[PDB]
Amino acid sequence: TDANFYVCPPPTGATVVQFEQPRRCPTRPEGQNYTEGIAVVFKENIAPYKFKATMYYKDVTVSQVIFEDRAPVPFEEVIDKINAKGVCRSTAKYVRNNLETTAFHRDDHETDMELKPANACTRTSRGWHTTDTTVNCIVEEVDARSVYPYDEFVLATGDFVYMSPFYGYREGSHTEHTSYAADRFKQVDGFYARDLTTKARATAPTTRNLLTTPKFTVAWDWVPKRPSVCTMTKWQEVDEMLRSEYGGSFRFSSDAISTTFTTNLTEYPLSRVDLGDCIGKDARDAMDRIFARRYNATHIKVGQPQYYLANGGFLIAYQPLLSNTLAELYVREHLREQSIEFARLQFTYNHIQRPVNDMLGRVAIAWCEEQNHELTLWNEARKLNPNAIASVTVGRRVSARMLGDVMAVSTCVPVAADNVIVQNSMRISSRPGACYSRPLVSFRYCDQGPLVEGQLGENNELRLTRDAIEPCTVGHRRYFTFGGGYVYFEEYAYSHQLSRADITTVSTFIDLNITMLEDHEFVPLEVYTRHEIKDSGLLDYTEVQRRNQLHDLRFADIDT
Amino acid sequence: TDANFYVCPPPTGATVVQFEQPRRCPTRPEGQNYTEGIAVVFKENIAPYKFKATMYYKDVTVSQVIFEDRAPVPFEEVIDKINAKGVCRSTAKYVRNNLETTAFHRDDHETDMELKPANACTRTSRGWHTTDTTVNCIVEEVDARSVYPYDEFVLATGDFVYMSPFYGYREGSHTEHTSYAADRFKQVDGFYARDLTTKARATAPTTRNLLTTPKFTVAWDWVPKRPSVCTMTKWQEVDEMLRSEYGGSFRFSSDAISTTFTTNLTEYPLSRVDLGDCIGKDARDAMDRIFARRYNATHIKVGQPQYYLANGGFLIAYQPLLSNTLAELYVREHLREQSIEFARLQFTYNHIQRPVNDMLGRVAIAWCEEQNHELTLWNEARKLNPNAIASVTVGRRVSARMLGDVMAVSTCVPVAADNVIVQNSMRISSRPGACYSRPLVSFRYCDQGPLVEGQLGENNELRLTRDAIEPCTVGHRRYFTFGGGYVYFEEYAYSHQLSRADITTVSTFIDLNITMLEDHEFVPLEVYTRHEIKDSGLLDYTEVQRRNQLHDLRFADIDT
Amino acid sequence: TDANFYVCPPPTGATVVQFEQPRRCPTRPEGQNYTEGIAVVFKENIAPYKFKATMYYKDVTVSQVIFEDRAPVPFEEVIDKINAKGVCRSTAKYVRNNLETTAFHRDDHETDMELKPANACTRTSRGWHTTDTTVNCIVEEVDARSVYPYDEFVLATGDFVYMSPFYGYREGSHTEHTSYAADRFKQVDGFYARDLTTKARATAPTTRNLLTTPKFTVAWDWVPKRPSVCTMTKWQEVDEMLRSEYGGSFRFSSDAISTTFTTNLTEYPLSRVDLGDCIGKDARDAMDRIFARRYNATHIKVGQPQYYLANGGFLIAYQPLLSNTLAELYVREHLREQSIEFARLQFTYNHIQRPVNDMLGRVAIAWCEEQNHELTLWNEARKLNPNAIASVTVGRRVSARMLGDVMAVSTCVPVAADNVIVQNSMRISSRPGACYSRPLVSFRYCDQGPLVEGQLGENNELRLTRDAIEPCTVGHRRYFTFGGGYVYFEEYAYSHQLSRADITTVSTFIDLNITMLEDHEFVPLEVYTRHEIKDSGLLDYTEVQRRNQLHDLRFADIDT
Ligand SMILES: *[C@@H]1O[C@H](CO)[C@@H](O[C@@H]2O[C@H](CO)[C@@H](O[C@@H]3O[C@H](CO)[C@@H](O)[C@H](O)[C@@H]3O)[C@H](O)[C@H]2NC(C)=O)[C@H](O)[C@H]1NC(C)=O
Ligand SMILES: *[C@@H]1O[C@H](CO)[C@@H](O[C@@H]2O[C@H](CO)[C@@H](O[C@@H]3O[C@H](CO)[C@@H](O)[C@H](O)[C@@H]3O)[C@H](O)[C@H]2NC(C)=O)[C@H](O)[C@H]1NC(C)=O
Ligand SMILES: *[C@@H]1O[C@H](CO)[C@@H](O[C@@H]2O[C@H](CO)[C@@H](O[C@@H]3O[C@H](CO)[C@@H](O)[C@H](O)[C@@H]3O)[C@H](O)[C@H]2NC(C)=O)[C@H](O)[C@H]1NC(C)=O
Ligand SMILES: *[C@@H]1O[C@H](CO)[C@@H](O[C@@H]2O[C@H](CO)[C@@H](O)[C@H](O)[C@H]2NC(C)=O)[C@H](O)[C@H]1NC(C)=O
Ligand SMILES: *[C@@H]1O[C@H](CO)[C@@H](O[C@@H]2O[C@H](CO)[C@@H](O)[C@H](O)[C@H]2NC(C)=O)[C@H](O)[C@H]1NC(C)=O
Ligand SMILES: *[C@@H]1O[C@H](CO)[C@@H](O[C@@H]2O[C@H](CO)[C@@H](O)[C@H](O)[C@H]2NC(C)=O)[C@H](O)[C@H]1NC(C)=O
Ligand SMILES: *[C@@H]1O[C@H](CO)[C@@H](O)[C@H](O)[C@H]1NC(C)=O
Ligand SMILES: *[C@@H]1O[C@H](CO)[C@@H](O)[C@H](O)[C@H]1NC(C)=O
Ligand SMILES: *[C@@H]1O[C@H](CO)[C@@H](O)[C@H](O)[C@H]1NC(C)=O
Ligand SMILES: *[C@@H]1O[C@H](CO)[C@@H](O)[C@H](O)[C@H]1NC(C)=O
Ligand SMILES: *[C@@H]1O[C@H](CO)[C@@H](O)[C@H](O)[C@H]1NC(C)=O
Ligand SMILES: *[C@@H]1O[C@H](CO)[C@@H](O)[C@H](O)[C@H]1NC(C)=O
């Protein structure tokens, strides 16, 4: 099948997903009162409120012989020139040398400028502009999001707006927080919106909020208030979890969680709050579902479900258990002492608790050791190729990059293969011997959209920048993934296209039945006379670690 | 033990091995009619036909003050001058400025040139040449291979010959395909071959084929026709496979396959073809072998073996099964409804099928999750060090590099440690402060062969190019693997050799009993006065990610 | 919790830890007699003798317009000027032009110089010096270590001293080995030590040894002799090990060992030496502990413990076992042949041994396959980030680097977060457009210690060199780990600090519930006019593999 191509834009940081790090596993099993049981960890219900905002700004530039800046759009212009007439004021106000100054579009007098779409293809971020000195008025319907505090919201651009999205002068608004004074905010009633693409005007009115930042103006529809919801959300249904008591604090460890939770040895009184009814059915029902799936025929339930507030804000709805084999030991000792309630007999018999502590202790330590093995390997992989790691973790193709020690993540735009065309030659005509490293591509986001240039990335990815150039060599032979197959190139010229089934795939880790042959180093004779480099394929880790050494030597030759 | 050294040449791409990529694992178990069973996936019997070909070409060059090219050897020269007299014509024909031109050897008149071996050590690719203007006639007995279509064959050099290896004017040849006209091909009958190493005219004649390409001439013995064989070959014996029905198509998943197969819900009528007897014994016998190994005491066979043609060309000889615990559920419900044949009772009871769908669903999803986890880690490792990844996958030391999105593979020549000698110093006398990074070595492929220079690579690998230079520091202390031990160097000078047992080994992932001590930086005093860089060992990933940053800054200083 | 920071100094190589490499797993199970049993592998008791030595040297330099070298401190100066008066001789003797020459401190006459601590903060390696021409007398109480041979000891600087630490003229000394003549060594009796920090002086005298090297003088207290101890030390308690006989040699394989051991098919007569009692209690007791933990209810002991001397110096105290299911097969055949002693019945019935050979064979091969998969991934990770890999392997934060094919290991100095202060801006004032890549930090090892400059590393690591510069862009937004949270920077200026819980954590490998949004590329307009690079975050693997390509192209433009 012809897989769809993807054009991943660089994330701006609106969504920064941090990723876990290794732990200090115990050298020997020291935690006392070890036990096994089911658990349903609940995360703080952040309640992400997503809405579509609208930014307004004007890019000012100077063409002398140098100075370029961005300015916001005043409220009267948004509500009258843009909202009603669908045009932008030619002039704009900015600051130069700490002095306010007025700007004129292409040294022309004040006139109205019509806003037109930035791209013909349909996109979530519609976008508009007046120009393709220069004062380009820009309007963009970017996305936005808020969280449980609802005190601030982040736009798609990544900049944070220090004001509640529900803020407003109407009743029931989030007036409790606003970092900007009244002169920088305004709310309009009976506001009618009109899409600049169609210009048909809204059918009914809806109050709209407006905010002016030092660099741009923002606006968004004002919803009254999202009704309250349960403060806890099921994060992960732990199929197997072990509780360990050490240092006056419980320690919950599991195989699929990759993290140890610490509590205070006391159950949270969930019955004293309304959450006892919300989580009372979300956790208890899940507990029985997990128990009836694999523990009904091998374990026995011990006591009622226990809720613990772990460090970091997580709530664990633990359910202690014990294997049937261990149950026989407890009942036998109970009969011996009697010469049944496992909730009380648990941990009472020290001679019975000591062996299980080591048995479960090794398992807990084993998980910690292997988890650290995967975490460190996974962490290094993130720094290597965050796109592949981010895509597999989120379950879908996604764009990502390292913003220091945290990962910024943002969805990619899929484009059908019918609109992607690979150029017949990757040789650059403006620089002999310095042609591109990957095939060039020309595509369009949609059938009616224009043809935008680009470059072929890794795993059907499309890059908007054709900057992947290299001192291109002689004897070049490379295969690049293109759709549901590969595009073969030779001597930096398109040779032909082949399907995915035309190449021997080593699918299983071990496949030693390869019909190999001793390759002969048939290199062109120009390598000995013209002294031009020969093809070496994608650089090896030791090669990049070696090429940079030559670079340092080259710099040394210059410093000398 | 003194392990053998290896000299891995760069593969030319004759054998390209694409490698699996991650999948879209289901978020929840949605596939219906889940079941467990044995399976023997069959790949199309490509039938690789390997034979030794022989290339003939002449390297033409000009000595003005510039122009070099390769030309083929005409047929009359191969069959008369080279085959009988064992000599090459001094003159050759090429093309310049779109005009055919003749070339003379060292501006001398036409004469006969004897072909001599290119190397003394016995190698599979024997090779011969006349010279060590200049017209060097070359003859090489490179390897070749063909596949199922038999319409083309690839030489060891990597270039493809668009003609069937069995092609010829004789009866029973593969005349159905040939991309070259009759003027470029010729077949000789009663041809006698004589090895230029011994001039031993053949004792028994064998017809020989000949082809002339735009760059070189090829020749090879013509075999009549390889007899037909079974069209399917056992690719992998799946010890545990799960079949899932979804979207009107089955889905076969396993733990060791790392790939999901899709079919058309209908068994291929294998009994209608001769393959029913070939696979009827190769698959059925393997099915019983796997079942009698681990499933005889815990599972029961359900129905006869089922053959399905999966997407991509694979044929899966599935054998549905079910655990004995699940069998009790089916028979119990059968007796309830009756108030036996599991092939008909399977999937009939929805209440019994629902829990197993979730049970096996997690297992299927678990395999997909971990497989994707390993695939990306493995794929990232391939781009890091394909030699180690290619060697472990194929089960033997192997050369490899990435030709874009596909990996080229070729064997390595093993050389005994007795013939490898490490130089007593890595300091370069032609460049102060810029000495090599790894030890230099001098070796010979054969005991009687000449001593060829080289450099020490990673894991006893021998590199023919001594280009691993770096700005060499002071206070250098490094260990390099050499044979069955290590070669210790100090201040870029050979210090001594130590065995593998002379260094503390971390054989178990976790080994915290290391007798460490707080190292003190006893850097030489010349670092503060001479300002020379101090030893830093092999560059850390963050260091290579930091050193390049300095390069751009250095370039910025130049662009200023 | 606010984790502690760490300042990791570069290891000098005093402790080198080689790490296992991939193996040649069998293609099919060929080993005969595969059995399953417990084992306790013993390593040679290296007996690391750690002691604190003391180096004495003087750094000589010339201030003309160039010549610098290090010289040792004579014995009379150490025992009289430094030991008694606590001062160093201003003059020193060095070699120049192959001629001994005298050096004076700052072209002054002969005078006494007082030794003062190098750092006010308390450290294990105290250190002292006279100066902060120039003759700086230095005294450092570095660490040292010796091993089983006790013929040589290595200092914290990594330099080896070819003399036994127990060497001396007194009775019971290790006079059997000394690579330095009498003129380079001296032992003082009744020596009184006085700490230069407090000129306290000794109350109880202790003999002190002294040795002079070509570059420095060493001294250390002479202990009579460490009494002998058991020659074997428990290295790893194997919970599951399989023995396989092949090629006239046993082959031991396990899951957690990652290495196959080869023996000579004959048990070592441990009862003939005293080790039969030391290991007789250490191995047998451990064997019963492992057996009583998991194998008591499923396996049966076969024969007495067997000790084998494996290749590499390891001793394996194997204990053959067999599952109860296999026991029934043996006893059943025994009864059939009778028409019990498992030690003699084992391997006697070939028909019973053949199936178990394949069963255990796949398990042994499976471990070898997965172990090789992890080894290469782990080895490739070591070359990427040895610090993270070294820390997890040793169980604690540790400094490490690659000294070629071996890894150097050393500890790190922990510093509390209270003494670490992050600078409010990472912008370099001496180089516009080339500001640092990571936040700068100022800290002190202790409260009373001085404030030393530094840079923030990865995972709370503190680097002493502020050389992590890069061409700093615009639109920069990065998060760096700092203590128990993150430090957010924008436009290379300190914005604010946030806790670890303020960022969404992807803890479980699969977390697809991310409240993602399509980020919009809001880039400053100066990118189009000033042509200044935009923020790209930490370089991707494909980016470093691409940025370096531009470097070669840039050099090609210089070479042109
Ligand atoms: C486990 O129990 C301990 C002890 O009760 C908890 O620590 C306590 O946490 C409370 C808040 O829940 C802290 O109160 C606050 O502290 C500071 C002043 O220290 C101030 O911001 C507020 O006015 C308020 O009083 C309290 O100080 C703290 N006590 C101690 C001794 O640490 C801890 O949170 C519990 N942990 C879990 C995971 O439940
Ligand atoms: C599952 O069944 C479907 C439907 O029968 C199979 O798709 C069909 O595959 C045949 C070849 O086996 C296609 O016929 C060929 O198609 C093209 C024109 O479309 C042309 O090259 C030939 O003249 C020939 O007719 C057929 O079009 C195609 N039908 C559809 C609807 O896709 C499919 O291959 C089966 N898959 C498996 C894994 O068995
Ligand atoms: C397995 O058995 C073989 C054969 O007995 C052992 O090899 C032998 O090892 C001894 C030392 O234990 C070698 O003796 C020494 O050899 C050299 C001269 O070759 C010299 O240094 C000494 O004078 C001494 O004689 C002996 O040569 C060697 N024999 C052979 C045939 O290689 C082997 O060590 C045993 N392996 C294990 C793991 O126990
Ligand atoms: C392990 O659990 C036992 C049983 O719950 C704990 O012993 C009890 O501790 C409570 C206080 O936590 C006392 O009131 C009881 O008298 C103790 N005994 C019994 C029989 O309940 C024990 O403290 C736990 N061990 C550790 C190390 O935390
Ligand atoms: C799961 O398997 C059942 C049983 O084979 C399928 O239901 C039968 O489908 C056949 C045609 O394939 C019909 O003739 C039968 O009447 C169906 N019912 C029974 C009781 O046999 C069912 O379609 C499969 N489920 C899915 C989702 O594909
Ligand atoms: C597997 O073990 C059996 C039993 O120890 C070995 O068979 C014995 O071999 C010895 C010599 O090594 C003979 O003296 C005995 O007569 C053999 N039989 C018995 C019952 O002890 C057998 O050699 C081993 N197999 C392999 C392949 O090493
Ligand atoms: C759980 O086990 C009980 C006791 O054997 C049994 O009655 C019940 O049906 C089982 N439930 C499931 C869902 O298997
Ligand atoms: C190819 O596979 C077959 C089994 O299908 C096996 O017997 C043979 O050894 C394999 N070839 C190689 C070279 O490993
Ligand atoms: C398989 O199981 C059957 C039924 O118990 C038994 O008769 C037969 O011997 C078993 N075969 C093997 C190879 O274990
Ligand atoms: C060394 O190993 C022993 C067991 O053999 C253990 O008790 C000890 O703690 C270990 N030492 C260190 C420093 O980890
Ligand atoms: C080991 O098993 C035996 C036999 O069932 C039993 O008597 C003994 O108590 C068990 N020992 C332990 C420590 O579980
Ligand atoms: C978020 O999690 C809920 C269950 O808590 C699930 O129903 C929903 O599909 C998840 N969202 C996504 C986008 O996967």
CA distance B500 to B482: 10
Measured between alpha carbons, how far is B410 from B102 in angstroms, rounded to an integer?
37
In chain B, what residues touch C311 (CB-CB under 8 Å)?
1
Cβ-based contacts of C556 with chain A (< 8 Å) = 433-434, 471
Give CATH 2.30.29.100 domain extents, chain C: 31-45+231-348
For residue A238, count other CB atoms closer than 10 A to its CB.
25
Q: Name the closest-CA residue to atom 12, ligand 11.
A: C292
The top-level CATH class assigned to B31-45+230-348 is mainly beta
What is the rounded CA–CA span in Å between residue C265 and residue C310?
10
CB-based contact A19 C480, cutoff 8 Å: no
Rounded to an integer, what distance in angstroms lies between the CA atom of residue C264 and that of residue C246? 11
The tokens for B518 are: 């707080």
Chain A hits for C385, Cβ within 8 Å: 380
Rg of chain C over Cα atoms, rounded to whole angstroms, equals 32
- How much distance in Å is there from the Cα of A480 to the middle of ligand 2? 27
- Number of Cβ atoms within 10 Å of the Cβ of C270: 21
Contacts of C19 in chain A (CB under 8 A): none
- The number of C-alpha atoms within 13 Å of A181 and in the hemisphere containing its C-beta is 2
Token look-up 């010469």 returns A339
Q: Taking Cα atoms as reference points, which of C474, C443, C473, C437 lies closest to residue C458?
A: C437
* Residues A139, B318: Cα–Cα separation, whole Å: 60
CA–CA dist B186, B212 (Å, integer): 9
Write the single-letter amino acid at C316. I
Q: Which residue matches tokens 């080895």?
A: C379
Instruction: For residue A397, give how far its alpha carbon lies from the nearest alpha carbon of chain C (Å).
Output: 11
The whole-angstrom separation of Cα A538 and Cα B408 is 11
H helix or E strand, kind and range, residue C129: strand C128-129
Ligand nearest to the CA of C358: 9
Per the rule left: phi > 0, alpha: psi between -120 and 50, beta: everything else, A13 is left
Distance CA A24, CA C395 (A): 7
Burial (0-12, 13-18, 19+ Cβ within 10 Å), A237:
middle
Distance from CA of A72 to the nearest CA of C (A): 14
Nearest CA to ligand 12 atom 12: C513
Neighbours of B423 (CB within 10 A): 15
Which of A8, A17, A131, A438 best tests the C interface by mutation, with the highest count of C CBs <10 A? A17
Residue corresponding to tokens 């952040």 = A46
Residue closest by Cα to atom 10 of ligand 9: B296
User: Strand, coil or helix: what is C473?
Assistant: coil
Q: At what angle do helices C541-559 and A541-559 cross, to 10 degrees?
A: 40
Determined by which method?
cryo-EM
Nearest CA to ligand 6 atom 2: C347
Instruction: Look up residue B503 and give its DSSP letter.
Output: S
Q: Quick one: tokens of C298?
A: 């499923």
Helix A324-338 and helix A350-384, axial crossing angle in degrees, nearest 10: 160
Are the Cβ atoms of B402 and A373 closer than 8 angstroms? no
- Residues carrying CATH 2.30.30.1230, chain B: 416-559
Using CA atoms, how far apart are residues C404 and B483, in angstroms rounded to an integer?
15
Instruction: Specify whether the CB–CB gap between B323 and B298 falls below 8 A.
Output: yes
Note whether C98 and C69 are within 8 A (CB). no
Q: How many helices (H) and strands (E) does chain A have?
A: 8, 36
> Which residue do the tokens 């040849």 mark?
B173
The rounded Å distance from CA B331 to ligand 7 centre is: 17
Which residue in B138, B155, B157, B162 sits closest to B58, CA to CA? B138
**Element of type H or E holding C557:** helix C541-559
Strands in C485-490's sheet, in edge-to-edge order, are: C477-482, C485-490, C493-499
CA-derived radius of gyration, chain A: 32
Report the chain C residue with the minimal C-alpha distance to residue A381: C381
Rg over CA atoms, chain B: 32
> How many H helices and E strands in chain C?
8, 36
Please answer whether residues C37 and C250 qualify as being in contact, where contact means their C-beta atoms are separated by less than 8 angstroms: no
List, as one string, the DSSP characters of B424-460.
Answer: SB---SSSTT--BSS-EEEE-SSTTS--EEEEE-SSS
Cβ contact A479–B358 (<8 Å): no
Instruction: Specify the residue with its C-alpha closest to ligand 4, atom 17.
Output: A348
Q: Which ligand is nearest to the CA of C263?
A: 3
Q: What is the 3-state secondary structure (H, E, C) of C280-340?
A: HHHHHHHHHHHHHHHHCCCEEECCCCEEEECCCCCEEEEEEEEEHHHHHHHHHHHHHHHCC
* Coil, strand or helix at B337: helix
CB A313 to CB C556 under 8 A? no
Cα-based distances in Å from B478 to A258, A464, B226, B491, C379 = 37, 44, 55, 9, 17
Determine contact, residues B306/B319, Cβ cutoff 8 Å.
yes
What is the per-residue DSSP string for A54-114? Answer: EEEEEEEE------EEEEEPPHHIIIIIITTS-EEES-EEEEETTEEEEE-GGG--S-EEE
Chain B residues in contact with C544 by the CB 8 A cut-off are 544-545, 548
Q: Beta strand pairing status for C16-19 and B504-506? A: parallel
Q: Interface partners of C (3+ CB pairs, < 8 Å)?
A: A, B
**Neighbouring residues of C558: CB distance < 8 A, sequence distance ≥ 6:** A558, B558
Q: Check if C309 has its Cβ closer than 6 Å to any atom of ligand 3.
A: yes
Report which of A117, A111, A142 is spatially closest to residue A132, judged by C-alpha positions: A117
Tell me the residue type at A331. Answer: V
Q: Which of A2, A520, A555 to mutate to test the interface with B (most CBs of B within 10 A)?
A: A520
| Reported resolution, Å | 3.0
Binary contact (C471, B385; C-beta < 8 A): no
Contact between C440 and C473 under an 8 Å Cβ cutoff? The reply is no
CB-CB neighbours of B414 under 10 Å: 16
Output the CA C540–ligand 2 centroid distance in Å: 42
CB A94 within 8 A of CB A71: yes
Does C17 sit within 8 Å of B504, measured CB to CB? yes
Q: Could you say which of A14, A313, A387 has the minimum Cβ distance to residue C517?
A: A14
Measure Cα distances from C314 to A409, B37, C25, C252, C484 in Å: 50, 43, 21, 12, 43
Separation of alpha carbons A504 and A496, rounded Å: 18
Q: Which fold has domain C416-559?
A: SH3 type barrels. (2.30.30)
Give DSSP secondary structure letters for B263-322: --SS---GGGSTHHHHHHHHHHHHHHHHIIIIITTTEEE-SS-EEEE-TTS-EEEEEEEE
d(CA B558, ligand 12 centre) in Å = 53
Q: How far, in Å, CA of B336 to CA of B328, rounded?
A: 12
Nearest CA to ligand 9 atom 12: B292
Q: Which fold has domain C31-45+231-348?
A: PH-domain like (2.30.29)
| Cβ-based neighbours of B246, under 8 Å, separated by 6 or more | B30, B31, B32
Which of ligand 12's atoms lies nearest the C-alpha of B27? 14
Task: Give yes or no for residue A33 CB within 6 A of ligand 4.
Answer: yes
Which atom of ligand 10 is found nearest the CA of C235? 5
For residue A151, give every residue at least 6 positions away whose Cβ sits within 8 Å of its Cβ, in sequence order, or none.
A162, A163, A164, A174, A176, A177
Name the nearest CA neighbour of A225 among A79, A47, A54.
Answer: A47
Q: Which of A359, A373, A380 sits opposite C385 (nearest CB)?
A: A380
Residue in the block written with tokens 């193996």: C23
Q: Which residues of A touch C552 (CB under 8 A)?
A: 470-471, 547, 551
Which is the closest atom of ligand 6 to the Cα of C32?
27
Taking residue B41's Cβ as centre, other Cβ atoms within 10 Å add up to: 26
The number of the ligand 12 atom at minimal distance from the alpha carbon of A235 is 5
Nearest bound ligand to CA C316?
A: 3
Residues of each domain in chain B carrying CATH 2.30.29.100: 31-45+230-348
Helix (H, G, I), strand (E, B) or coil at A259: coil
Alpha carbons C270 and C280: distance in angstroms, whole number: 9
- Choose the closest CB to A516 out of B15, B24, B378: B15
